[PDB]
RNA sequence: GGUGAAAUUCUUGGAUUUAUUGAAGACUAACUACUGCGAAAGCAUUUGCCAAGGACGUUUUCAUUAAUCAAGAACGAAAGUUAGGGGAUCGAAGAUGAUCAGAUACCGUCGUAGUCUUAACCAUAAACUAUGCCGACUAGGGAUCGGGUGGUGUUUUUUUAAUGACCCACUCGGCACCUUACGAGAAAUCAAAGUCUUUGGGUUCUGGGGGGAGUAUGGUCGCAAGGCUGAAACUUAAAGGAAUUG
């Protein structure tokens, strides 16, 4: 069966620490605990070390990256404007 | 252990006698056990590359940046931050740049930075939920947790101390010149109450 | 009379019947 | 209080080869005093000029075009050129309404390695028996017309030099072999090369300059 | 087309896929055209690049990883590479660049 | 009682325009609700042209047009000379002049 | 054999704009505005100021040595008007009949290939 | 600077203006129309990939598989909600300068949220053609978009071809328009709002005087704001629609 409504994984927190809070931290605990597709191997076989530390387990790269994902938002854009920035100096 | 961001253990030959020396860097988003990293003025301008600050185009995102030249980083070394060059001047060369509390600043040209984003960004941006979570935070760091407000003690301990309710009593916004015993509560403040910016 | 804000009113003035039966617990 | 043009003195500027009349007018600058080079006060400015003046003839009437200050030889100028535009009542002439508007750029380096953004510019028009009143293209047609325009503005580039580039502008070679090539898919009449931008230029090479200077 | 130039190569002939079935189809000379991924390792590239120059096979590099060419020619697998034996009746051994 | 058969203004077919601001009252509008008119004249009002005749180098040179196109809300149309309230009879044209 | 500056003026609402400079821009030379020849503290758009500026205009470009000049009228433009001042016309008449030779105008307003919100609210500036 | 006119603000540390550059985020001008596409909400810079769609064509194919639909589902402008990004511009709140008898309004300068965006919600607008969908039929006329057919037809002149463009003529399909009613309507008007007291082609939803009231209550959805469903006591002789004259 569907085990519960909405907790999901926050079960483990039961009825303590509000229920936003607990909302917040579900999110994020869901995106560390994921398993990310390897850059390299194309294999689903990333995951979170300690944070910002992603690591694929049979290739064994080791990718710094998010505190709970594997890219953020911000660093996808930066390798944008770099790009961008390089692909210029290269002409 | 007790920093938020990683760290890169970076391996290059000596040039000058046979061996390795290895450098201990602080790891930018995106790069990966064994990447090759360049550093120095002609290196090319890929995240995990350190560059003069002079040698990077006017928009360029770094971190790990000196203020002085070969202070080996100082500005913009914890998760997720960064710096942004804003521009040149190659008379007495000087790189204008941002840092990451939005001050402006201007440094020499040859002082050294590392292409792109350090990583652990968003680090902040979970609920630590329990007193604990935070007690090994700081378990790692330095012994400043818990705090107990200055006013629940008494006038001995604390110019906030003492009084049959508990309340500050004078303002809490303390001179700059003022002088140690003296400085608790919001030091040379110019504002205070709730932001509108 | 504006039907627009003889409606806001209307609710304005209606979720604090709900917010007061809730009182009377 | 002062008068400050008393401190000031004048250049004369001296056009590239590439343009029929090169002796074009004067500038201002303060003059060279204790660690005051008004030599770098002068190099780096740039002006724009009607082709009608630097060739002489109004049927390029329209079509300004910006020439920079690169090394001066002592009291002359010599230049280089930086970039050409259509005037803006030329452009707002020819967009007029009931008809297509095309337009396309490509960015592309020169024999000499300059990178530079080119822009184009066509309006469908009526076939001579026409009767009715717009003659608009047909989105295919104008990515066909668009395709084969960017192909012959980036063969062109690279397979001539900048200065060559000034060559074959002048004589608006390119408008007729982009009407060479798009007779055949849809009418068209104010077909031009709109703009010209350098984006990038290379290492200076200050003999490519003294090439146009007679 | 572009693509399906390999929807061809599975019905009207016969190949061969994954690294060290396609080592056996080229030293065995026998192999008309690999098809490498994009993100198999470099070292592994220029391991089936050097058979290539030996073997006088001439050989494609894939827009996607070994996870969008194993899609590419039906199977539900990854795969690095892929070795053509006969196009048969395909479209692909003449038609490149 | 609905006064138009174009509603407002002329848009039949779609359902969503998009809107544009007035000139003289930076009013959003849908596009195809704007009263619309080109300022097309020259940059020399009336006379001010054989007073400059003389004063000028270039003895072929031709007079440049400033293009402007204008669009109004309803409310700054009727309130100007741009648009005025017709007939009922008289509404239904569409003759400029 | 006769020398050229480059007028640029601009011709805003509440103000109109009249100073020339070398045909390449950096340096300039005196600057007169509109409210520099009025103080009402209004009509610093009108065409009466602007002539008073072109004529204060032109004497400082003889005593300098502008025989003539190309002329780059502009409105404000950007998203705002477009539609240059009422102060435009009379400056550049006060300066062919002031004696400059001239030639080769252009509308420089800038425009946007349009972008960026405009003032006044969906509702526009009601008065 | 701004305005009817002012003032708030900025400025001899040079503002405004100029010229040379650079960054950032939103937008997609002119071309842009009684033109296109989409179930609707909506969609306008280039190119690439990804699936999709109507119309047209058809001496292809299956053969009644179909119309409309309680229950149940997808999508659903703007604003709004939660979290991250983003935050140039405009800007609910707010702050201010005016105006004013007052003026936390209109006007002026700021300006938070918001405006953009990813991941979740919300489910409503004069969400309008205020016109359900399917089918059939009944007037006159000229344009236009798509596709097709026809011609020793104009240019493409590449020699003539052949395409594309155009021209003329047909046609299927679509956005609309003009005239007119022979019919309809309380009228405004209507080519459907016609083919109805000469009243029946099929079907779904909704209305039964005005208030009270989209309130109370129950249920349900929502984090919330709120949405969906929804009375009654009570009160009232009119409210209302279209047009006419002043
Ligand atoms: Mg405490
Ligand atoms: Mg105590
Ligand atoms: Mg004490
Ligand atoms: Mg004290
Ligand atoms: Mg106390
Ligand atoms: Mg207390
Ligand atoms: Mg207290
Ligand atoms: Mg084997
Ligand atoms: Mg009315
Ligand atoms: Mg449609
Ligand atoms: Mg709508
Ligand atoms: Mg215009
Ligand atoms: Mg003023
Ligand atoms: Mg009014
Ligand atoms: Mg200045
Ligand atoms: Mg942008
Ligand atoms: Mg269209
Ligand atoms: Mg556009
Ligand atoms: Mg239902
Ligand atoms: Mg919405
Ligand atoms: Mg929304
Ligand atoms: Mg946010
Ligand atoms: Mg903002
Ligand atoms: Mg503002
Ligand atoms: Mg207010
Ligand atoms: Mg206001
Ligand atoms: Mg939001
Ligand atoms: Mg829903
Ligand atoms: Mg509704
Ligand atoms: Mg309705
Ligand atoms: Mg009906
Ligand atoms: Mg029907
Ligand atoms: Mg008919
Ligand atoms: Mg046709
Ligand atoms: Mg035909
Ligand atoms: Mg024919
Ligand atoms: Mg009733
Ligand atoms: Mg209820
Ligand atoms: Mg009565
Ligand atoms: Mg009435
Ligand atoms: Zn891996
Ligand atoms: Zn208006």
């Given at each position: 069966?569907?085990?519960?409504?909405?907790?999901?994984?926050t079960?483990?927190?039961?009825?303590?620490?509000?229920?936003?809070?607990?909302?917040?931290?579900?999110?994020?605990?869901?995106?560390?605990?994921?398993?990310?597709?390897?850059?390299?191997?194309?294999?689903?076989?990333?995951?979170?070390?300690?944070?910002?530390?992603?690591?694929?387990?049979?290739?064994?790269k080791?990718?710094?990256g998010?505190?709970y994902?594997?890219?953020?938002?911000?660093?996808?854009?930066?390798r944008?404007?770099?790009?961008?920035?390089?692909?210029?100096?290269?002409? | 252990?007790?920093?938020?961001?990683?760290?890169?253990?970076?391996?290059?030959?000596?040039?000058?006698?046979?061996?390795?020396?290895?450098?201990?860097?602080?790891?930018?988003?995106?790069?990966?056990?064994?990447?090759?990293?360049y550093?120095?003025?002609?290196?090319?301008?890929?995240?995990?590359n350190?560059?003069?600050?002079?040698?990077?185009?006017?928009?360029?995102?770094?971190?790990?940046?000196?203020?002085?030249?070969?202070d080996?980083?100082?500005?913009?070394?914890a998760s997720?931050?960064?710096?942004?060059?804003?521009?040149?001047?190659?008379?007495?060369?000087?790189?204008?740049?941002?840092?990451?509390?939005?001050?402006?600043?201007?440094?020499?040209?040859?002082?050294?930075?590392?292409?792109?984003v350090?990583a652990?960004?968003?680090?902040?941006?979970?609920?630590?939920?329990?007193?604990?979570?935070?007690?090994?935070?700081?378990?790692?760091k330095?012994?400043?947790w818990?705090?107990?407000?200055?006013?629940?003690?008494?006038?001995v301990?604390?110019?906030?101390?003492?009084?049959?309710?508990?309340?500050?009593?004078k303002?809490?916004?303390?001179?700059?010149?003022?002088?140690?015993?003296?400085?608790?509560?919001?030091?040379?403040?110019?504002?205070?109450?709730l932001?509108?910016? | 009379?504006?039907?627009?804000?003889?409606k806001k009113?209307?609710?304005?003035?209606?979720?604090?019947?709900?917010?007061?039966?809730?009182?009377?617990? | 209080v002062?008068?400050?043009?008393?401190?000031?003195?004048?250049?004369?500027?001296?056009?590239?080869?590439?343009?029929?009349?090169?002796?074009?007018?004067?500038?201002?600058?303060?003059?060279?005093?204790?660690?005051?080079?008004?030599?770098?006060?002068?190099?780096?400015?740039?002006?724009?000029?009607?082709?009608?003046?630097?060739?002489?003839?109004?049927?390029?009437?329209?079509?300004?075009?910006?020439?920079?200050?690169?090394?001066?030889?002592?009291?002359?100028?010599?230049?280089?050129?930086?970039?050409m535009?259509?005037?803006?009542?030329?452009?707002?002439?020819?967009?007029?309404?009931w008809?297509?508007?095309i337009?396309?750029?490509?960015?592309?380096?020169?024999?000499?390695?300059?990178?530079l953004?080119?822009?184009?510019?066509?309006?469908?028009?009526?076939?001579?028996?026409?009767?009715?009143?717009?003659?608009?293209?047909?989105?295919?047609?104008?990515?066909?017309?668009?395709?084969?325009?960017?192909?012959?503005?980036?063969?062109?580039?690279?397979?001539?030099?900048?200065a060559?580039?000034?060559?074959?502008?002048?004589?608006?070679?390119?408008?007729?072999?982009?009407?060479?090539?798009?007779?055949?898919?849809?009418?068209?009449?104010?077909?031009?090369?709109?703009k010209?931008?350098?984006?990038?230029?290379?290492?200076?090479?200050?003999?490519?300059?003294?090439?146009?200077?007679? | 087309?572009?693509?399906?130039?390999?929807?061809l190569?599975?019905?009207?002939?016969?190949?061969?896929?994954?690294?060290?079935s396609?080592?056996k189809?080229?030293?065995?000379?026998?192999?008309?055209?690999?098809?490498?991924?994009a993100?198999?390792?470099?070292?592994?590239?220029?391991?089936?690049?050097?058979?290539?120059?030996?073997?006088?096979?001439?050989?494609?590099?894939?827009?996607?990883?070994n996870?969008?060419?194993?899609?590419?020619?039906?199977?539900?697998?990854?795969?690095?590479?892929?070795?053509?034996?006969?196009?048969?009746?395909?479209?692909?051994?003449?038609?490149?660049? | 009682?609905?006064?138009?058969?174009?509603?407002?203004?002329?848009?039949?077919?779609?359902?969503?325009?998009?809107?544009?601001?007035?000139?003289?009252?930076?009013?959003?509008?849908?596009?195809?609700?704007?009263?619309?008119?080109?300022?097309?004249?020259?940059?020399?009002?009336?006379?001010?042209?054989?007073?400059?005749?003389?004063?000028?180098?270039?003895?072929?040179?031709?007079?440049?047009?400033?293009?402007?196109?204008?669009?109004?809300?309803?409310?700054?149309?009727?309130?100007?000379?741009?648009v005025?309230?017709?007939?009922?009879?008289?509404?239904?044209?569409?003759?400029p002049? | 054999?006769?020398?050229?500056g480059?007028?640029?003026?601009?011709?805003?609402?509440?103000?109109?704009?009249?100073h020339?400079?070398?045909?390449?821009?950096?340096?300039?030379?005196?600057?007169?505005?509109?409210?520099?020849?009025?103080?009402?503290?209004?009509?610093?758009?009108?065409?009466?100021?602007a002539?008073?500026?072109?004529?204060?205009?032109?004497?400082?470009?003889?005593?300098?040595?502008?025989?003539?000049?190309?002329?780059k009228?502009?409105?404000?433009?950007?998203?705002?008007?477009?539609?240059?001042?009422?102060?435009?016309?009379?400056?550049?008449?006060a300066?062919?009949?002031?004696?400059?030779?001239?030639?080769?105008?252009?509308?420089?307003?800038?425009?946007?290939?349009?972008?960026?919100?405009?003032?006044?609210?969906?509702?526009?500036?009601?008065?």
């Open positions: 069966a569907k085990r519960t409504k909405k907790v999901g994984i079960g483990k927190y039961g009825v303590r620490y509000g229920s936003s809070l607990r909302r917040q931290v579900k999110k994020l605990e869901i995106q560390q605990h994921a398993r990310y597709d390897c850059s390299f191997c194309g294999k689903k076989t990333v995951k979170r070390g300690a944070a910002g530390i992603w690591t694929c387990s049979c290739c064994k080791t990718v710094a998010g505190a994902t594997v890219s953020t938002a911000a660093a996808a854009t930066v944008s404007t770099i790009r961008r920035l390089r692909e210029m100096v290269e002409a | 252990s007790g920093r938020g961001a990683p760290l890169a253990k970076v391996v290059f030959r000596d040039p000058y006698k046979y061996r390795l020396r290895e450098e201990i860097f602080i790891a930018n988003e995106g790069v990966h056990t064994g990447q090759f990293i550093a120095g003025k002609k290196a090319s301008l890929n995240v995990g350190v560059l003069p600050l002079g040698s990077v185009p006017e928009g360029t995102i770094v971190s790990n940046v000196e203020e002085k030249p070969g080996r980083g100082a500005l913009a070394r997720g931050n960064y710096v942004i060059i804003i521009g040149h001047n190659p008379d007495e060369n000087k790189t204008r740049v941002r840092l990451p509390s939005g001050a402006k600043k201007v440094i020499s040209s040859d002082a050294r930075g590392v292409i792109g350090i652990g960004g968003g680090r902040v941006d979970k609920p630590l939920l329990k007193a604990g979570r935070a007690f090994h935070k700081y378990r790692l330095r012994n400043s818990p705090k107990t407000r200055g006013v629940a003690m008494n006038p301990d604390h110019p906030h101390g003492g009084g049959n309710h508990q309340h500050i009593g303002a809490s916004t303390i001179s700059r010149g003022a002088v140690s015993g003296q400085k608790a509560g919001l030091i040379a403040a110019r504002r205070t109450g932001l509108r910016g | 009379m504006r039907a627009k804000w003889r009113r209307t609710r304005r003035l209606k979720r604090k019947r709900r917010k007061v039966r809730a009182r009377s617990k | 002062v008068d400050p043009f008393t401190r000031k003195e004048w250049f004369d500027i001296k056009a590239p080869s590439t343009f029929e009349n090169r002796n074009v007018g004067k500038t201002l600058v303060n003059k060279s005093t204790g660690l005051k080079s008004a030599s770098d006060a002068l190099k780096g400015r740039v002006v724009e000029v009607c082709l009608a003046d630097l060739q002489g003839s109004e049927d390029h009437s329209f079509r300004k075009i910006k020439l920079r200050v690169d090394e001066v030889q002592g009291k002359n100028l010599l230049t280089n050129f930086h970039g535009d259509f005037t803006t009542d030329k452009l707002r002439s020819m967009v007029r309404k008809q297509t508007l337009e396309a750029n490509v960015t592309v380096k020169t024999s000499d390695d300059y990178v953004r080119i822009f184009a510019i066509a309006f469908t028009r009526k076939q001579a028996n026409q009767v009715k009143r717009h003659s608009y293209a047909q989105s295919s047609h104008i990515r066909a017309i668009r395709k084969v325009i960017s192909e012959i503005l980036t063969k062109e580039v690279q397979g001539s030099t900048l060559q580039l000034t060559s074959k502008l002048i004589p608006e070679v390119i408008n007729k072999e982009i009407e060479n090539a798009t007779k055949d898919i849809f009418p068209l009449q104010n077909i031009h090369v709109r010209v931008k350098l984006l990038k230029q290379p290492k200076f090479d200050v003999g490519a300059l003294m090439a146009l200077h007679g | 087309s572009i693509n399906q130039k390999l929807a190569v599975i019905k009207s002939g016969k190949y061969t896929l994954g690294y060290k396609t080592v189809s080229l030293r065995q000379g026998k192999s008309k055209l690999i098809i490498i991924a993100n198999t390792p470099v070292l592994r590239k220029s391991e089936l690049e050097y058979y290539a120059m030996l073997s006088k096979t001439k050989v494609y590099y894939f827009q996607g990883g996870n969008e060419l194993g899609t590419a020619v039906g199977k539900l697998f990854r795969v690095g590479v892929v070795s053509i034996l006969e196009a048969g009746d395909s479209d692909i051994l003449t038609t490149l660049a | 009682p609905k006064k138009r058969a174009s509603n407002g203004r002329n848009k039949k077919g779609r359902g969503h325009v998009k809107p544009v601001r007035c000139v003289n009252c930076s009013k959003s509008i849908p596009k195809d609700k704007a009263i619309k008119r080109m300022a097309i004249r020259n940059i020399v009002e009336a006379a001010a042209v054989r007073d400059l005749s003389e004063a000028s180098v270039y003895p072929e040179y031709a007079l440049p047009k400033t293009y402007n196109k204008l669009h109004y809300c309803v409310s700054c149309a009727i309130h100007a000379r741009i005025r309230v017709r007939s009922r009879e008289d509404r239904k044209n569409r003759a002049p | 054999s006769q020398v050229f480059v007028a640029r003026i601009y011709a805003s609402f509440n103000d109109t704009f009249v020339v400079t070398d045909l390449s821009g950096k340096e300039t030379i005196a600057r007169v505005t509109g409210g520099m020849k009025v103080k009402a503290d209004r009509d610093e758009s009108s065409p009466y100021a002539m008073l500026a072109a004529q204060d205009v032109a004497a400082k470009c003889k005593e300098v040595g502008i025989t003539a000049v190309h002329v009228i502009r409105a404000t433009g950007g998203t705002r008007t477009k539609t240059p001042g009422p102060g435009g016309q009379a400056a550049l008449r300066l062919a009949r002031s004696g400059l030779r001239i030639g080769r105008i252009e509308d420089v307003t800038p425009v946007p290939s349009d972008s960026t919100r405009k003032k006044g609210g969906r509702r526009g500036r009601r008065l």
